[PDB]
Amino acid sequence: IIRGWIFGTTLDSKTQSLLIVNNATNVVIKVCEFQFCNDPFLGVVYSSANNCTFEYVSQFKNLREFVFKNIDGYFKIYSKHTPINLVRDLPQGFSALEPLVDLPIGINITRFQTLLALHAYYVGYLQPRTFLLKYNENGTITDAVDCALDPLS
């Protein structure tokens, strides 16, 4: 039911607004400006198409994890699909996230908002911390530990 996320810095067609939408057959990404849309809809949102400067087209229950990062105009999305379910309603366990795509968009990004199919998701944050990682023999991350949490750490 979760479909996509609409980003921006003013939520108006005046300034660049990135947009990602799942089509159930091909994900679509574009940077063309769109006017404000408080209540997105869908059925098988669009109000302005000024300055279309990019386009891209590509491809226990499921708990998909994403991490969105932005450095000097580069947009990185790290994704993971199948986690380990120790208990329901609480995502315990360890997982590793792989890099999906790099976007040289340069959009400036201050805020965003998600999209649902009208007819449960957790949000986190990041800080510049220091970590220690133990690499497996094959190349995967198997364990990590903090460096500013506990005296033992």
Next chain:
Amino acid sequence: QIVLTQSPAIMSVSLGERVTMTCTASSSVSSSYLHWYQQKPGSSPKLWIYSTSNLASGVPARFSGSGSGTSYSLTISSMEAEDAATYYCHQYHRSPYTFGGGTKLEIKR
């Protein structure tokens, strides 16, 4: 084709003054395709004003004029002794090329 008609047939105008001459056509020919020659008696014509604004070599910057559309105007500054010549309008837009009706410029004593 479009025939070129000159409103005045002949100018028996005295020396010193400043008048104008007109080339008239049934329709607009071009902004800059037309031109004017000068057929001296018993000689060959020579072009001075081309592109309807520009001037060829040898013009003392005395002969001028402006216009567009179905009618064009060519102006002078002050008549002198060498102005007793002939003038011919031209057009090159359409495939049949025609000439102006001609004006027998002359001075009066």
Next chain:
Amino acid sequence: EVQLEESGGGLVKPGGSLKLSCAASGFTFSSYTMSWVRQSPEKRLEWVAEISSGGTYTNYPDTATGRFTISRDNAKNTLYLEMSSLRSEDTAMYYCANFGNYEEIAYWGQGTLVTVSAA
């Protein structure tokens, strides 16, 4: 240059054919389109017929559709022009000049009296 010297003319018969050869030299003839104009005694100038040296193309007004022929030769640089079955009304004086080519149109021919006779 020598200013587009033309073949000499003369009196002819109403039913013959005179040839005008505007041979010349002094500038390139592979890209300069020639033209033929005529003037009857004290009458408006009238463009007779032009030829295109770029592809040696012939086109000319419809006042005389099928009685004008032009041949170009860049080898010896000659411009051959004739009319079929000339009448006594065709007496005039002819120029070969430069039309269609570079913007600075100039170099009108020296002229040649192409007149008819009945005596």
Next chain:
Amino acid sequence: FASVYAWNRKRISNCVADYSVLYNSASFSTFKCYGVSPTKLNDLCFTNVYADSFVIRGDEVRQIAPGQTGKIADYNYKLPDDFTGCVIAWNSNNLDSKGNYNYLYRLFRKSNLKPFERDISTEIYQAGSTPCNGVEGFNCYFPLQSYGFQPTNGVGYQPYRVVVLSFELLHAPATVCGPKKSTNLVKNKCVNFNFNGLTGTGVLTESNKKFLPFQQFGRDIADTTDAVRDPQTLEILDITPCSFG
């Protein structure tokens, strides 16, 4: 192609197109630019490539240059002196001939135009102070004019097609670069290598280590790159320092 008074504008991004094939051809009569030589066109990388296309009369091809005047250079198109691009103009005598008169251009305008301005309008410009509207009259002039591109015209009157390319010097993250050269590979030799930016020296050998489908090169310790996969084959290799003693 569009007329000059409404010049066709297009944007090209996210591609790698060789520029050598352009000036290596013979159809392009005029290939003029100063901001960059043809040799280093493919060497450099650019951003925001814009193409402007139109059809004009031959005799005024000179008027398309940085800092020039004229009817076309003032009322139909503007070229700033600080221009970073190139101009390609070539004859289209056999493609636009009969003559044909479907072309138009701006003749009268209030003043000059800002750089890269698109001058579109339709008004009865008046050569006096009396206000005339609706129909043309005395000292009321039609802003446009046509072209007599007769097939049997000479030089300067045949229609010419003009394309102007502009760009910026990577003011944003790189979008369009030039083609990158490639060569073969050798084994069991002391060679210096430049694998897509990663440069070094050593001897190349075949490897049995397994990479994940998304890394590019591995290492062991102390910033000592040891294993690299070739982008062409996606085959993992081994680096070994050349012998000395």
